[PDB]
């Protein structure tokens, strides 16, 4: 009910405070935090390379996937590395934010699914061979 949500709120806050002191709620909360920090860092260095996406890509809900697919496919065209994986996240992040700017909130949960599927289907195998997300955590954040 509201019961499951309060537990989720408690866990979230506790996770955050542990990480501030070098601890982690779980392996997953450690991945999420590192990835967050990797995303901030990437955006700080390179935001100018992927600004104004909705004008550049002519985003509408009906065409957005075609755009997403095109950019991500080029991104990983020749292969995968952790850096590209970070850019992938940072791209989806910005695609989402801008969509909301343009009052296309409907795209956020769609982009989230496309990201999840692509990560699941095309990024995971590489991840699993290259030391898993635990490696990522060591190299980033």
């Amino acid at each position: 009910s509201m019961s499951q949500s309060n537990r989720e709120l408690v866990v979230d806050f506790l996770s955050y405070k542990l990480s501030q002191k070098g601890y982690s709620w779980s392996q997953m909360a450690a991945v999420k935090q590192a990835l967050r920090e990797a995303g901030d860092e990437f955006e700080l260095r390179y935001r100018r390379a992927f600004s104004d996406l909705t004008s550049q890509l002519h985003i509408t809900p009906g065409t957005a996937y075609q755009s997403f697919e095109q950019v991500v496919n080029e991104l990983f065209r020749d292969g995968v590395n952790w850096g590209r994986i970070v850019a992938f996240f940072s791209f989806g992040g910005a695609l989402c934010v801008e969509s909301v700017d343009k009052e296309m909130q409907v795209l956020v949960s769609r982009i989230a699914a496309w990201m999840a599927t692509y990560l699941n289907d095309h990024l995971e195998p590489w991840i699993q061979e290259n030391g898993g997300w635990d490696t990522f955590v060591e190299l980033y954040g």
């Binding site: 990797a38 860092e41 990437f42 260095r45 390179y46 390379a49 992927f50 996406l53 550049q56 890509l57 095109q70 950019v71 991500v72 496919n73 080029e74 991104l75 065209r77 590395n81 952790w82 850096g83 590209r84 970070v86 850019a87 992938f88 940072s90 791209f91 190299l139 980033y140």
Partner: peptide, 18 residues
């Protein structure tokens, strides 16, 4: 040719040093 290539090449610099 833009956005994705200049993601790819951000990406490889942040591989190179990270």
């Amino acid at each position: 040719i833009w956005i994705a290539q200049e993601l790819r090449r951000x990406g490889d610099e942040x591989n190179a040093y990270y």
